[PDB]
Amino acid sequence: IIGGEFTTIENQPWFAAIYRRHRGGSVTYVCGGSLMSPCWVISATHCFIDYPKKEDYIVYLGRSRLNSNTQGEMKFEVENLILHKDYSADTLAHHNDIALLKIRSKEGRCAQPSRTIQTICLPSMYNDPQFGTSCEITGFGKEASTDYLYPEQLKMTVVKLISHRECQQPHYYGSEVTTKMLCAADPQWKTDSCQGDSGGPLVCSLQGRMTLTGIVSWGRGCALKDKPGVYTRVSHFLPWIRSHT
């Protein structure tokens, strides 16, 4: 996240950190995700597409730091890895960029609630906040586009939803943005999601609940003027979500 503040998992208890094992000994961060129900985490297909080997990923819940442990964290293996079949990537956009991970611990259970592990709510069919709404994003992604390392402390920031009319202006993204995407930016193009933040949540208050309104998907550069962050529009994937969980 470019800008923002450092935070702790208690402020985003549904955030899930996904890593990949290289039996050579290292475990590297891949993407973020969100806990939907005890056994299901939702993220973005583009984080897995290149290596759909579920057995090589590890998912942690209740984590405030990237490579050190947090007291209360839970470790899970990926029992099922569901990618969208109509996922497609083009020069910038990722289409149908949503994925589901069914988790299981070594004891054979799913997540349990704690002050650091909670689920986030899903929107009602095709129901979104109106543009102008401030939503927050969280993640362990880059703090500057030129960095080649990820921060060790979790970060969060606030961005506002913008209209499709504004985002589809030729000098923003044109027709690369579809009705199945949402754009969110900082009025002053100072804070934004960036590389490493994919798969994580765009949370807004909708009908009185903190709802998973979007999943970090793509963007040109990070915090660039007229280049908003683009998110998968969760409200338009509810049937898909329901069919598999």
Partner: peptide, 13 residues
């Protein structure tokens, strides 16, 4: 009653 019921989506404690 079972742990799962304690989940309350969207609530920060």
């Amino acid at each position: 009653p079972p742990e799962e019921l304690k989940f309350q989506c969207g609530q920060k404690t």
